[PDB]
Design an enzyme around this catalytic site. Structure first.
Site, PDB file in Angstrom:
ATOM      1  CG  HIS A 148      17.902 -15.092   4.630  1.00 51.23           C
ATOM      2  ND1 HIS A 148      17.999 -14.694   3.307  1.00 51.23           N
ATOM      3  CD2 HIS A 148      16.655 -15.552   4.793  1.00 51.23           C
ATOM      4  CE1 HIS A 148      16.878 -14.952   2.702  1.00 51.23           C
ATOM      5  NE2 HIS A 148      16.058 -15.502   3.572  1.00 51.23           N
ATOM      6  CG  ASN A 155      13.665 -13.693   0.662  1.00 49.72           C
ATOM      7  OD1 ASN A 155      14.657 -14.255   0.145  1.00 49.72           O
ATOM      8  ND2 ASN A 155      12.963 -14.242   1.656  1.00 49.72           N
TER       9      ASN A 155
HETATM   10  C1  LIG Z   1       4.620 -10.131   5.148  1.00 47.90           C
HETATM   11  C2  LIG Z   1       5.039  -9.073   6.196  1.00 47.90           C
HETATM   12  C3  LIG Z   1       6.158  -8.154   5.585  1.00 47.90           C
HETATM   13  C4  LIG Z   1       3.771  -8.276   6.506  1.00 47.90           C
HETATM   14  O1  LIG Z   1       4.074  -7.293   7.508  1.00 47.90           O
HETATM   15  P1  LIG Z   1       2.877  -6.641   8.391  1.00 47.90           P
HETATM   16  O2  LIG Z   1       1.648  -6.154   7.537  1.00 47.90           O
HETATM   17  O3  LIG Z   1       3.544  -5.684   9.442  1.00 47.90           O
HETATM   18  O4  LIG Z   1       2.407  -7.951   9.210  1.00 47.90           O
HETATM   19  P2  LIG Z   1       0.904  -8.548   9.561  1.00 47.90           P
HETATM   20  O5  LIG Z   1       1.208  -9.809  10.474  1.00 47.90           O
HETATM   21  O6  LIG Z   1      -0.017  -7.382   9.888  1.00 47.90           O
HETATM   22  O7  LIG Z   1       0.444  -9.145   8.082  1.00 47.90           O
HETATM   23  C5  LIG Z   1      -0.394  -8.382   7.175  1.00 47.90           C
HETATM   24  C6  LIG Z   1      -1.472  -9.329   6.626  1.00 47.90           C
HETATM   25  O8  LIG Z   1      -0.803 -10.435   5.934  1.00 47.90           O
HETATM   26  C7  LIG Z   1      -1.260 -11.707   6.377  1.00 47.90           C
HETATM   27  N1  LIG Z   1      -0.104 -12.588   6.384  1.00 47.90           N
HETATM   28  C8  LIG Z   1       1.164 -12.274   6.773  1.00 47.90           C
HETATM   29  N2  LIG Z   1       1.921 -13.412   6.701  1.00 47.90           N
HETATM   30  C9  LIG Z   1       1.150 -14.423   6.197  1.00 47.90           C
HETATM   31  C10 LIG Z   1       1.356 -15.830   5.821  1.00 47.90           C
HETATM   32  N3  LIG Z   1       2.552 -16.438   5.949  1.00 47.90           N
HETATM   33  N4  LIG Z   1       0.257 -16.524   5.399  1.00 47.90           N
HETATM   34  C11 LIG Z   1      -0.956 -15.911   5.264  1.00 47.90           C
HETATM   35  N5  LIG Z   1      -1.218 -14.647   5.551  1.00 47.90           N
HETATM   36  C12 LIG Z   1      -0.179 -13.869   6.003  1.00 47.90           C
HETATM   37  C13 LIG Z   1      -1.771 -11.465   7.817  1.00 47.90           C
HETATM   38  O9  LIG Z   1      -2.719 -12.444   8.300  1.00 47.90           O
HETATM   39  C14 LIG Z   1      -2.354 -10.041   7.660  1.00 47.90           C
HETATM   40  O10 LIG Z   1      -3.692 -10.183   7.142  1.00 47.90           O
HETATM   41  P3  LIG Z   1      -5.038  -9.836   8.006  1.00 47.90           P
HETATM   42  O11 LIG Z   1      -4.745  -8.480   8.647  1.00 47.90           O
HETATM   43  O12 LIG Z   1      -6.182  -9.961   6.986  1.00 47.90           O
HETATM   44  O13 LIG Z   1      -4.938 -10.972   9.027  1.00 47.90           O
HETATM   45  C15 LIG Z   1       5.550  -9.750   7.499  1.00 47.90           C
HETATM   46  O14 LIG Z   1       4.455 -10.519   8.091  1.00 47.90           O
HETATM   47  C16 LIG Z   1       6.789 -10.634   7.324  1.00 47.90           C
HETATM   48  O15 LIG Z   1       7.915 -10.106   7.170  1.00 47.90           O
HETATM   49  N6  LIG Z   1       6.579 -11.982   7.423  1.00 47.90           N
HETATM   50  C17 LIG Z   1       7.647 -12.984   7.311  1.00 47.90           C
HETATM   51  C18 LIG Z   1       7.708 -13.522   5.886  1.00 47.90           C
HETATM   52  C19 LIG Z   1       8.457 -14.841   5.827  1.00 47.90           C
HETATM   53  O16 LIG Z   1       8.087 -15.833   6.433  1.00 47.90           O
HETATM   54  N7  LIG Z   1       9.553 -14.887   5.032  1.00 47.90           N
HETATM   55  C20 LIG Z   1      10.342 -16.129   4.850  1.00 47.90           C
HETATM   56  C21 LIG Z   1      10.263 -16.610   3.337  1.00 47.90           C
HETATM   57  S1  LIG Z   1      10.858 -18.287   3.144  1.00 47.90           S
END
Ligand SMILES: CC(C)(COP(=O)(O)OP(=O)(O)OC[C@H]1O[C@@H](n2cnc3c(N)ncnc32)[C@H](O)[C@@H]1OP(=O)(O)O)[C@@H](O)C(=O)NCCC(=O)NCCS
Ligand SMILES: CC(C)(COP(=O)(O)OP(=O)(O)OC[C@H]1O[C@@H](n2cnc3c(N)ncnc32)[C@H](O)[C@@H]1OP(=O)(O)O)[C@@H](O)C(=O)NCCC(=O)NCCS
Lengths: 383, 383
Positions: A295, A328
């Site tokens: 997933h 997703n």
């Molecule tokens: C969202 C995603 C694609 C972003 O990729 P990325 O830009 O390389 O990752 P970063 O950790 O630099 O996140 C970018 C910004 O988003 C914010 N962010 C990412 N995940 C977050 C969350 N769950 N809550 C709040 N802010 C979030 C970060 O704090 C960052 O902001 P900042 O630079 O002002 O702190 C990646 O974090 C991801 O795949 N996360 C997992 C998502 C998830 O949990 N999916 C399950 C769904 S049930």
């Protein structure tokens, strides 16, 4: 009481999506325009960086700009809108699920009166009678089909429906189980607030789709049944130290979700224990010697698992492909990955439906934090 | 994998209800007073007749007058109140379910670590993670318990959880399945309108409760396991000409329900077909030669079935007794009936757990119109 012999297998896979497409390059500008939030210039550029880093290039999406012009309450940050969302979704969820089911039935090639059971999961809606009832009626199934309705599982539910189907198919000689997942993100769409990045992550990653499988034991080759994957063993577990990290709530404002920043680390730090439990009985310890059906909850979950286990980059190709083209889609996503794996294996001349490997693992991840695990075996491709 | 030999059986039953009671003789005056509706003098007298004919003497009810004074939006006829109902029910549903489970585990007498699976159904609430997650945590079950969450089934769901447990327990040697139903009618409580008798029928009949069973194959007498009923065969069907007759919808105003006047006739005109399908393979045609475990959806359902089939008055003793002391508690009700049957059979000197009979039938009825059927066998009461 006549039980079946030998293991349940996936005999067919079908998928469907809404026609309308969101191109990710255009999505920051589209989202801030339709939500009347163009004044939020700094937040819009933060959102563009989230969308660029997501590795999602396009998503299918039923909700369109004409829906938003007809009901502008849907673009507000937080407004009483559940009844409008439900009025759409109680119709569209079973309709898109039936479309996926019809494609699975066509591949299987048997009469639809041979379907004995129907499993349906969605996190986008809830109603009585449910989407299972409507899907069965739209397909013209027997009124005595035995239904298993599972509302509000979330992103692990693709694994759950296989686990439920395995025991039904093995305990009942002749049983043929239709199992379908379907989600439509109109349930959770809403406008931005100045500080709320958690909301924006969901608005960037969730997309629409349905996927259906036929599951049965004792496939009959003489009538044209053909196994694709065998379902060997199952597990469901709650990760330690993970309370509250993935949630979703049915509220007056719609579906309200919780996504903690620690989710990629929690999955990656616990997944080896899952693999050891699953594979020690089979005599396997090399995670690069199996195929993977994973997933793609986000790009970070895939990247951190691969790094923790020192996986070769071959393992996640189909997860990355589905993520890129669909985002997703909740429970259905892992079944799109299964379909792509077996199709690519044939196109590339591989020896089995699992990229040439014998043994494989399927994983779903969602609220709890819950992990669904299925050990699978491929089938040879004979040329 | 190792499968079990022989049939799955119910090994233990536990039940629970809120402590607060509604006496039916006082309910017309209570309801019209707390909903600030005493000016509806003719409607209140019609309601008094409905309550007097209902054959319900008392119901247990978590919602109390102090809840209604704290939040007067709950006594309006139609008002945006789902968030307040969910805030209560996401907590109280798994709590009352855990109380029933703990009583079943005490009877069973084995360590709770031997529970391998947990099935949970409720129509009163929906959330991610669900009531199954919270109930498992409150009980201290293994984190690897395999969960089956089924939200929004409705009044047929006591049959459904038995049907799911049967195939899990038979297909997995050693499996021990905990299956629980729980409903709390705060989800649907609201004030009257001048014309609407359908709403008032539900306000008169629905009450609160939870019921839990432990199901397993290969009982081990040496450690103190004892079967109560064997689960022989199952069916689920949708009745002809019944679309729209029983419904329930999750809306901003709470749970909104549909109940058609034709429900008792539709069940009674189709139930013989269900019996012939279930019992012809066993050689049985005399519906007075078996015991009955029947969901008491209302007094009229029971009355019309008894009349149609010429059932002796013994058949519905326990169904009527549970209706009298608890009302209609949705899916849990049929499991209260099963507990009362086996307890009365012991107290009154009968030779089996099913009122002295060998074979029996269990029925649940709800949205679709769906009928769940289980053929059961009693066990001897010997000294
Ligand atoms: C969202 C995603 C694609 C972003 O990729 P990325 O830009 O390389 O990752 P970063 O950790 O630099 O996140 C970018 C910004 O988003 C914010 N962010 C990412 N995940 C977050 C969350 N769950 N809550 C709040 N802010 C979030 C970060 O704090 C960052 O902001 P900042 O630079 O002002 O702190 C990646 O974090 C991801 O795949 N996360 C997992 C998502 C998830 O949990 N999916 C399950 C769904 S049930
Ligand atoms: C409610 C009940 C106990 C009343 O018993 P009763 O008073 O002996 O039965 P009656 O048919 O004379 O009904 C009394 C009044 O309630 C009204 N009523 C009963 N069921 C009703 C419904 N589903 N919708 C609207 N009005 C209804 C009747 O029309 C009648 O009013 P009227 O004289 O002004 O027309 C009985 O009808 C019953 O058990 N019904 C089945 C309930 C049911 O469907 N349960 C399933 C829940 S999912």
């Amino acid at each position: 009481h006549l039980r079946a012999e030998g293991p349940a297998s996936v005999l067919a896979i079908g998928t469907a999506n809404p026609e309308n497409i969101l191109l990710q390059d255009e999505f920051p500008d589209y989202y801030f325009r339709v939500t009347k939030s163009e004044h939020m210039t700094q937040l819009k550029e933060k959102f563009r960086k989230i969308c660029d880093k997501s590795m999602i290039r396009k998503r299918n999406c039923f909700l369109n700009e004409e829906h938003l012009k007809q009901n502008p309450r849907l673009v507000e940050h937080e407004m009483q809108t559940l009844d409008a969302r439900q009025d759409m979704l109680v119709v569209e969820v079973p309709k898109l699920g039936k479309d996926a089911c019809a494609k699975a039935i066509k591949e299987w090639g048997q009469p639809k009166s041979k379907i004995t059971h129907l499993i349906f999961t969605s996190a986008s809606t809830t109603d009585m009678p449910g989407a299972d009832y409507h899907c069965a009626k739209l397909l013209g199934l027997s009124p005595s089909v035995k239904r298993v309705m599972m509302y509000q599982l979330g992103c692990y539910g693709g694994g759950t429906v296989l686990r439920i189907a395995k025991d039904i198919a093995e305990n009942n000689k002749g049983a043929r189980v239709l199992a379908v997942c379907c989600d439509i993100m109109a349930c959770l769409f809403r406008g931005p607030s100045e500080s709320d990045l958690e909301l924006l992550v969901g608005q960037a990653i969730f997309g629409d789709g349905a996927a259906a499988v036929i599951v049965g034991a004792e496939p009959d080759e003489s009538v044209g049944e053909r196994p694709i994957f065998e379902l060997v063993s199952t597990g469901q577990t709650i990760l330690p130290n993970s309370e509250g990290t993935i949630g979703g709530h049915i509220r007056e404002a719609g579906l309200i979700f919780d996504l903690h920043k620690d989710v990629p680390m929690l999955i990656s730090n616990n997944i080896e224990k899952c693999l050891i439990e699953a594979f020690t009985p089979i005599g396997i310890s090399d995670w690069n010697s199996i195929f993977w059906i994973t997933h793609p909850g986000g790009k970070a979950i895939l990247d951190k698992v691969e790094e923790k286990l020192h996986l070769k980059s071959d393992k996640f190709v189909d997860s990355r492909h589905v993520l890129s083209e669909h985002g997703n889609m909740s429970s259905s996503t892992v079944l799109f990955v299964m379909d792509e794996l077996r199709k690519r294996s044939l196109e590339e001349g591989k020896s089995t439906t699992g990229d040439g490997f014998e043994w494989g693992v399927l994983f779903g991840f969602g609220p709890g934090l819950t992990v669904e695990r299925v050990v699978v075996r491929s089938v040879p491709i004979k040329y």
